Structure formats: C-alpha cells, structure tokens
C-alpha cells in the first residue's frame, strides 16, 4: 500500500486509494492541506497510482519541490517506484513529504472474497493458495477452522502473524473510510494491528514457533497428503516425517519400529484406536501451543 505523511503541529498520514487523484497544498480544496507555509502553492503537488508495478505518478505544480536534491520544474512529471521510504522536500523551509510503499500481502479464507477488490484498491494484496512467496498476514478463525487445515501450520512455522477475520472486516469497514476523514491512518493501523482481540494466539509469532521445538527428534507418521506436502513445513523443525497410503501401511511401520520409540500419528480424525492415539493437525497444533502433547504421542 501507499502511505503519504508529513508536518500546534499535526502529524498527518493517509492511505492512498488507487485511481484517486490526490493533492497537497495550502488551498482548502486539497485532500491534504499544508497550513502555515506561504512557500506552498494553492495546489502544490498532485499524485495518483494504479494497479512492485504499483508505482506512484506525481506532477509538480509548485515553486520549490526537491526529490533527492534534484529540483522539479513547474509541471515536471516524476514517479516513485514500488526499497525503503521516499521523501520529497517542498517549500523554502522544506516541508518533507514522505511516500512509503508497504507491500502488504494477506492470506485470507475463501468466504472473505467479497473484500478483495477494496483491499486491492488500497494496496493490500490478498491470496488464497499458500503459493510460494510468503504473505505477511494470515487471516484465520482458528480454532473454528477445518481440522486438517495446513494454513495455521504454515503460518505458525513461517512466523506469519495470524489475526481473526474481524480484523480484515473492521479495517475495510472502519479505519479505511475514517483514515480519510481524519488523516491519522498510521495511528489507526497501529491500534488495529496491536489490538489483542484480533489475535488468534496469545504469543508473538516467533514465540509460538518456539513452542514448536519440543518435537526435537521424533517420528511423525501421517495419512495426510497435504497442500504444501507437510514434510516441507516440518523439515524446518528437523523432524523425521513419514507418509503412508492408508492407515494400514502406517500401522505396519509401528510394528517395525523398536520399542520405546516416540511417534504420533496425524490422521483424518481425533480418536483412540488399537490402543494407539490418533490426532489431526488442529489437535496437534493445540497440544503444542498448550504443551499437552504428552497426552498424544505414543511409544512402542
């Protein structure tokens, strides 16, 4: 997303909506007024971007406007590319205006498809396949989520932060139209992003992953042919992952394994059977984060 920010001193910030032609000046008719500076024209500078690749297009309408020390001629068109921030200095006393590209890509559940267009209109990208280039935010409704979902698994192991879906809907419903009405986008974002009632879990991502190390050296034996083929996610935690065509083929292996060998079995279903204890991803996750794994591993 594109954020612009500048400047009783009032810190103003605002999320740039695509295709809208924005403008900074002293004239009241601007979306973003700079007060208290005569070096600032009626309409001093304008800009709009459209759907990396989401570059910003600016055109200087004011007397003094400097980008990285090179000075715009009145009317000159210049652009800012979609790293870090970029600042353009305006006026005699330089008023420093900052344009940041915050490449936000969110992984969302399918029922929230109705919000994708809006999110993209404000530079928040969404995805449904866990794809390959990681996302920075996983919208998830765990524990109210499919029992053999790999999504929470993928994010927990990828230290991607997980937030309830109301976070997504509150952002679109509230802080988006309001950031316009009060030029404090940055404060709202950081309230919403640090507000705990949108958190799925009680610990920071990397702390969550820390609870994932008691796996240590253990055999994980599974009936599940998964999206990012599981073994990948768990190659991280350096764990012997073993897959079987039907729970038959897996029960075979247990007899072959020596006694007092530790294993758990990740199956379609939570239930005890043949003395052994069979669990699913969601139960394994939960026992890990809770620490109650012991009541789920078996030994031979």
Residue numbers in the entry: 1 to 7, 14 to 57, 64 to 94, 98 to 315
What is written in the article reporting this PDB entry?
The MRN/X complex is a multi-protein assembly composed of MRE11, RAD50 and NBS1 in higher eukaryotes or Xrs2 in certain yeast species and serves as an initial sensor and responder to DNA double-strand breaks (DSBs), which are among the most severe forms of DNA damage. NBS1/Xrs2 is a scaffolding hub for protein and DNA interactions with the complex. NBS1/Xrs2 contains a folded region at the N-terminus and a long intrinsically disordered region (IDR) at the C-terminus.
Here, we report the first high-resolution (2.38 Å) structure of the folded domains (FHA–BRCT1/2) of Xrs2 from S. cerevisiae, which will advance our understanding of its functions in the DNA damage response and telomere-length maintenance. The loop residues Asn7–Gly13, Asn58–Leu63, Ser95–Val97 and Gly316–Lys325 were excluded from the structural model due to weak electron density in these regions. The FHA domain is comprised of eight antiparallel β-strands, whereas the BRCT1 domain contains three α-helices and three short β-strands. The BRCT2 domain, in contrast, has six α-helices and five β-strands. Firstly, BRCT1 has the smallest B factors (all-atom average of 72.85 Å2 for residues 118–157 and 175–224), whereas BRCT2 has the largest B factors (all-atom average of 92.84 Å2 for residues 158–174 and 225–315). Conservation of this charged region suggests that the homologous phosphorylated Sc Sae2 peptide binds to the same region.
